[model samples]
Target: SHMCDAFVGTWKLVSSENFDDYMKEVGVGFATRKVAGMAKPNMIISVNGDVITIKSESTFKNTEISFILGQEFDEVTADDRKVKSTITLDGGVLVHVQKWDGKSTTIKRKREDDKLVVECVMKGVTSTRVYERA
Candidate 1:
């Protein structure tokens, strides 16, 4: 899919919705969220066979995560927090199941219009983050 190919390139954060609330739910402080919201995080993605590597780089932190297309694996975030996850394709959408600190988290990615949408549900917080082509 063309959209899937688009995911292979690097992307920079342009804007977000309810970002402050999203960060707060993740235990990030007000000050940190303020700074983070202003920063343009860079995402680099590479896919080889069924393995996908996504790297999120920012001035404050750099996170690199790798997973197989349909296989589950343990993913440790940049902060050293571990999560069990699997990235798979459902129709044309990409789906992820993430288990963090014994809690289950689910995320999905799809291209809408000219933007890429990431829908995340963790704990009791549900948010959508979008990215435009860079």
Candidate 2:
């Protein structure tokens, strides 16, 4: 069965907008946030059978996750918040919705046509990141 194959590539972070507000919203310390804002994250996305793996690597911190479509799993956000997260493929966009502390967050991600874009929104603050093939 064909499940997830729309996103399978190595992408490098290109640009970040409103990162400070977004980082603050995620509970990252000011000192750490300052450096992270200037760092580039390499996003490696892979797929095998029914599982999808996403990895973000940088000098500041490195993170990776593996999950099946529509299945909920525990995730620790970069800012150290533990939340239940699920990702769904939609219109070439990987929509990630997370639940934590009685509230919820929706994240958007996609890699296609040599362009990669990711975003997160919370309390009217939004962070947009763009990427390109490596």
Candidate 3:
């Protein structure tokens, strides 16, 4: 089992792969998605007991989301969409379960070669987004 301590820290986005595609799949406009692709993102994570707060900030926008580890809670997306999410640790991977519009999805995150790889699956759509270390 992976401990929560491994995930607590500030991470910067050095580079991104397939981020625009993921945004497009979420119904983001072409211009907005283009901006998002160019903007650098800063991710800050704070863990307190079972509660965790994740902040993703950039010149374009700033979004802060919080959830309880292993417990479902309401989460607001970057586009102001609401969803239910639960986080958990499976070995060295961080797993997130998100439910929106009556559909449930799963996301798995891991670090590889100084990059964070996030794989999300929902409604037969699978997106792999990668973020490099800052």
Best by TM-score: 2
Candidate 2 lDDT, tens digit per residue, 1-134?
35545557788888899989977776679887888888898989888888899999998899999999899999997778899999987876789998988877788986656677789887788999999988
lDDT of 3 by residue, 14-121 (tens): 555566666666666878877777877777777876677878888989988777667778887766568888888787788988777776768897877666777877
Candidate 2 segments exceeding 4 Å error: 1-3
| Estimated TM-score for each candidate | 0.80, 0.89, 0.78
> Highest lDDT: which candidate?
2
lDDT of 1 by residue, 1-134 (tens): 44367678777676677766666666667777787777677778878766688888889788887877778888875434577878888887889887775666677877778777888676777778787767
**lDDT measured at residue 57 in model 2 versus the true structure, 0 to 100:** 94
The worst-scoring run of ten residues by lDDT in candidate 2 lies at 1-10
Worst 10 residues of 3 by lDDT: 1-10
Relative to the unseen true structure, what is the C-alpha lDDT of residue 124 in candidate 2, on a scale of 0 to 100?
86
Q: How accurate is candidate 2 locally (lDDT)?
A: 0.84
